[PDB]
Amino acid sequence: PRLSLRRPALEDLLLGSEANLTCTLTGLKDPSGATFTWTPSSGKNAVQQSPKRDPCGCYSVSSVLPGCAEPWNNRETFTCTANHPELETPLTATISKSGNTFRPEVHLLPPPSEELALNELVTLTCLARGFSPEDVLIRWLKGTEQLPRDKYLTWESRKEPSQGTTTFAVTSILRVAAEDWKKGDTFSCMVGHEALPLAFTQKTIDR
Amino acid sequence: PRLSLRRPALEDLLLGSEANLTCTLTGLKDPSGATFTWTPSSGKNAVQQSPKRDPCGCYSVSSVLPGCAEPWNNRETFTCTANHPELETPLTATISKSGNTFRPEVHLLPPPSEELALNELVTLTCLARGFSPEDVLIRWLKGTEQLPRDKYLTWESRKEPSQGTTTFAVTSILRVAAEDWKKGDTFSCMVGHEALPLAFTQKTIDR
Amino acid sequence: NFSTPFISTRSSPVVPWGGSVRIQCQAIPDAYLIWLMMLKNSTYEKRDEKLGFWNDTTPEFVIDHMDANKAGRYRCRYRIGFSRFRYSDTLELVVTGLYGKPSLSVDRGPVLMPGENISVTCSSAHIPFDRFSLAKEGELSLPQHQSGEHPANFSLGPVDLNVSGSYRCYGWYNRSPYLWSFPSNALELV
Amino acid sequence: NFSTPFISTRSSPVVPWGGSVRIQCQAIPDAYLIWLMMLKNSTYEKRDEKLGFWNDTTPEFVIDHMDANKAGRYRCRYRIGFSRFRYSDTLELVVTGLYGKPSLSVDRGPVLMPGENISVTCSSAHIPFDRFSLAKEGELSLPQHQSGEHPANFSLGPVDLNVSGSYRCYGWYNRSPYLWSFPSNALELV
Ligand SMILES: *[C@@H]1O[C@H](CO)[C@@H](O[C@@H]2O[C@H](CO)[C@@H](O[C@H]3O[C@H](CO[C@@H]4O[C@H](CO)[C@@H](O)[C@H](O)[C@@H]4O)[C@@H](O)[C@H](O[C@H]4O[C@H](CO)[C@@H](O)[C@H](O)[C@@H]4O)[C@@H]3O)[C@H](O)[C@H]2NC(C)=O)[C@H](O)[C@H]1NC(C)=O
Ligand SMILES: *[C@@H]1O[C@H](CO)[C@@H](O[C@@H]2O[C@H](CO)[C@@H](O[C@H]3O[C@H](CO[C@@H]4O[C@H](CO)[C@@H](O)[C@H](O)[C@@H]4O)[C@@H](O)[C@H](O[C@H]4O[C@H](CO)[C@@H](O)[C@H](O)[C@@H]4O)[C@@H]3O)[C@H](O)[C@H]2NC(C)=O)[C@H](O)[C@H]1NC(C)=O
Ligand SMILES: *[C@@H]1O[C@H](CO)[C@@H](O)[C@H](O)[C@H]1NC(C)=O
Ligand SMILES: *[C@@H]1O[C@H](CO)[C@@H](O)[C@H](O)[C@H]1NC(C)=O
Ligand SMILES: *[C@@H]1O[C@H](CO)[C@@H](O)[C@H](O)[C@H]1NC(C)=O
Numbered sequence A, B: 001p002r003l004s005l006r007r008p009a010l011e012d013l014l015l016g017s018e019a020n021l022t023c024t025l026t027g028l029k030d031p032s033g034a035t036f037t038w039t040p041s042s043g044k045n046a047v048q049q050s051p052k053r054d055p056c057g058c059y060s061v062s063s064v065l066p067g068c069a070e071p072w073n074n075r076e077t078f079t080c081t082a083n084h085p086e087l088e089t090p091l092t093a094t095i096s097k098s099g100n101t102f103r104p105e106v107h108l109l110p111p112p113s114e115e116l117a118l119n120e121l122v123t124l125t126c127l128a129r130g131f132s133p134e135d136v137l138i139r140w141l142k143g144t145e146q147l148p149r150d151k152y153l154t155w156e157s158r159k160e161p162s163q164g165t166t167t168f169a170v171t172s173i174l175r176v177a178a179e180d181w182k183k184g185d186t187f188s189c190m191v192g193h194e195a196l197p198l199a200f201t202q203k204t205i206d207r
Numbered sequence C, D: 001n002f003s004t005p006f007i008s009t010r011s012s013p014v015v016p017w018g019g020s021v022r023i024q025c026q027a028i029p030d031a032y033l034i035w036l037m038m039l040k041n042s043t044y045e046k047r048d049e050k051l052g053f054w055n056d057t058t059p060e061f062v063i064d065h066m067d068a069n070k071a072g073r074y075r076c077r078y079r080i081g082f083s084r085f086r087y088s089d090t091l092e093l094v095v096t097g098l099y100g101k102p103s104l105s106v107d108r109g110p111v112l113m114p115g116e117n118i119s120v121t122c123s124s125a126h127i128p129f130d131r132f133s134l135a136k137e138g139e140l141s142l143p144q145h146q147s148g149e150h151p152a153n154f155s156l157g158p159v160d161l162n163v164s165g166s167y168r169c170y171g172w173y174n175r176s177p178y179l180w181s182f183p184s185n186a187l188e189l190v
């Protein structure tokens, strides 16, 4: 049996209004007796969830407390403690808004010289680099319209072999039709990150 | 309980000489009685392994048959069947060298214009795109020396939102010192892939 | 204190039901998220959502295929950082082509030199509109003149040429201030 | 049939123990993987490994800090596709600076005009070398002349100027064909 605690997601933080945060206890073929206790009390009340029958003999059980959008931003340490329908000693976790930061450095880079000559589809790339917790959000823009997530591909954050400061990196690709590029309209990549002061930061592209 | 079968890895196929292939049975708090049966017989003999005590109550058990480097290349369908120390009906899997292909298209792309001006460290990028099974190998080269894996970062293959043909994509970044770039020496990215005729294919970069 | 950002409709803010216009807000460039609201029933609700910064222009919306649904109080919503929410002063939109064209007319000739007065009389004989509004072309706002007496007595006083061009007139009821009649006959004042 | 790729040592292939040289193979450009071997004891073993294609030059290795370990039979290994393995004809390397410098000398003057003969006598009085090899500078190969009689009787016949420059001489034993003596005294034939 193990307990893990899950932070609010920048997705729900920035583009939304309902950070949940999730304390989930994992495995032990239990009736899910459980019981969860949380830090900021009273304000909003905590909610348990279905024993989402985790593969094998885990049957994991989860918790959320809605509305914790403001206490995340004022740092404030969050605790979760669960004492479970088995034995031994209850389990507990805790997180908070990460200390050290490091703003992303964002770079939107051009189609291949050898690919754009063959006027068909070509590749826009977006590079988030050297930042704080691995969690980021990259959204592409045509003109000034958010493209549906399904039109562009984004890889996940992974630690880069860094000299000292452990920093992350992310890339994204938007494949587009050449006539749009040679025509002259505008594309952008935008990266939202916990550190960054204005939340997201935009950097654009022309040719 | 479930059984999965794992193909040889291009890493061991191309840069090595001992493709194993792995049939691993997962979960059921078993003594790992088991028993595994395989397709190309006799030639080389199959090997079982330790009940690598998989989290929760799985205790997964694995199999390999060494030396199957040549039957992979001549297509030949591989089978694995396991009848386990529990009950019901034995489990079986099968794979082979994937049918449809699609060679990668590889593109090594430049440092940001706005980053190279600030002569310090800058970014080389490598883009594997539209290819066959997701499994690829990207290796960077300085001059004509393979850099250790630890000097460059490679993301994993992920399906790109493709029109029809389901194709994959991979990116890689090598961060390097500016003096090397303005000096004039040569860097390369190389992509190895099941489809590609010469195994790997190199494409280089100057400025 | 502050002003709060502006709300404009660069094309005249009244459109035939199914019409298209180029609505525009001001651009707080420290606000990534901008939300066009329609203050609908006690509250306000998201219609369009344009994300990003504007270190250049100002943000425009576009309402096409203008509905009875799409008429009311429109307001911009700016999100700065992680808690700053700045609004915008309100704008309203109204549709045309709903009831039945009123008919308007003059007391003098169609080119009155304005040293002396011209009143327009606009009314409907078979559609008991609550009020009437006399709509000039071009000018990007809710009409200069509106009344609710049984003849539409709209004189112009001593006119002057920034009062010139093409004019029409629309009906209006009580609880459909957003829903107006068809366009009437045109007045080419010169 | 085929030739099979060539093996060269662009700098003279014998080096003082701890010496550095620029070994070079031929480039099968349909072979991504290239393996320098030293045919060591019944087999062959990987020393260096250069991956990639050469649609330009030919592939060079470099052996620096030349060891007794690093002397023997060297061979290139090419991997084409998924089963083609093409070798290369063999090369050998040998170290110097191990036993004790022999001493060499002439029968005539240091600038013999070659219409007539010059023999060099090279030997060691205190180090019973199996054989001796007389090493010209520059020329990129195992020596033109080698003997195993108690005086090194190496004449040149009627010389000609492509036999000119600086010359020395090295000792040699039975089962260390890869391990040679120190460089002797120099002969500036002109
Ligand atoms: C509590 O808050 C948590 C935050 O972690 C929520 O759990 C998350 O819920 C979201 C739902 O918004 C999960 O995403 C799911 O929906 C995604 C929607 O994508 C759509 O894209 C189209 C564009 O064509 C757009 O028009 C739609 O409006 C919509 O945006 C979907 O992409 C997600 O799948 C992705 O994510 C998984 C996980 O990484 C990935 O493996 C998939 O390949 C795929 O890319 C998903 O279906 C989100 O996954 C989930 N959190 C996590 C960590 O998975 C709860 O909803 C909140 N609960 C309450 C009560 O407030
Ligand atoms: C049977 O064949 C399988 C093939 O799947 C083998 O299982 C694989 O074994 C390899 C071992 O070569 C596993 O990789 C492990 O070693 C990697 C070595 O990296 C080093 O990098 C330095 C450069 O600084 C270099 O000088 C070293 O010589 C060496 O190359 C290491 O990178 C691996 O960790 C990576 O992989 C995991 C899995 O994706 C990833 O999550 C990590 O973050 C990390 O990036 C690993 O330590 C390889 O992982 C493993 N296969 C799988 C699928 O994991 C067996 O060894 C073969 N068995 C027999 C009996 O032949
Ligand atoms: C608006 O909603 C409130 C309560 O939701 C209701 O009392 C009222 O009748 C609604 N209509 C208007 C025009 O305010
Ligand atoms: C305009 O704003 C963008 C950020 O969206 C910034 O990158 C750019 O430098 C700004 N322009 C100038 C002239 O500073
Ligand atoms: C216009 O109307 C005003 C208001 O009664 C009046 O004083 C003025 O004389 C009028 N001008 C004319 C009739 O030319």
Ligand SMILES: *[C@@H]1O[C@H](CO)[C@@H](O)[C@H](O)[C@H]1NC(C)=O
Pocket: C117, C119, C153, C154, C155, C156, C157
């Ligand atoms: C109607 O408007 C005209 C415009 O000045 C004015 O002369 C007249 O007195 C008004 N009459 C009524 C009844 O409003």
Ligand SMILES: *[C@@H]1O[C@H](CO)[C@@H](O)[C@H](O)[C@H]1NC(C)=O
Pocket: D041, D042
């Ligand atoms: C080489 O190895 C074989 C067997 O491995 C052995 O018989 C022999 O003595 C070794 N030495 C030489 C010089 O071949």
Ligand SMILES: *[C@@H]1O[C@H](CO)[C@@H](O)[C@H](O)[C@H]1NC(C)=O
Pocket: B202, B203, D053, D055
């Ligand atoms: C040389 O070979 C490379 C592949 O390594 C290829 O990309 C390039 O086009 C070739 N040069 C010419 C002139 O074809």
Ligand SMILES: *[C@@H]1O[C@H](CO)[C@@H](O)[C@H](O)[C@H]1NC(C)=O
Pocket: D115, D116, D117, D157, D158
């Ligand atoms: C060089 O040696 C040959 C071989 O004995 C001999 O015939 C010839 O005369 C010699 N040349 C001289 C001594 O000049």
Ligand SMILES: *[C@@H]1O[C@H](CO)[C@@H](O)[C@H](O)[C@H]1NC(C)=O
Pocket: D117, D119, D153, D154, D155, D156, D157
């Ligand atoms: C030694 O070499 C010289 C070179 O021609 C020759 O004249 C002489 O006969 C040789 N003698 C012996 C014993 O080899």
